[PDB]
Amino acid sequence: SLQALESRQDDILKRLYELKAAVDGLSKMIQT
């Protein structure tokens, strides 16, 4: 339960940083 919440939140964070990598990658290659 509490052992499963932190693993869940760990995934959310891992997925949130993957989104950021993609979003930031886009912001670079379409500029000016």
Partner 1 sequence: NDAVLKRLEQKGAEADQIIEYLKQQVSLLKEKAILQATLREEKKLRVENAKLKKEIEELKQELIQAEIQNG
Residues that bind partner 1 (CB under 8 A): 1-2, 5-6, 8-10, 12-13, 15-17, 19-20, 22-24, 26-27, 29-30
Residue with tokens 């940083």: 17
Give the Cα separation of 10 and 16 in Å (integer): 10
The CB-of-14 to partner 1 minimum distance in angstroms stands at 10
Amino acid in the structure at residue 21: A
The CB-of-31 to partner 1 minimum distance in angstroms stands at 9
The CB-of-22 to partner 1 minimum distance in angstroms stands at 5
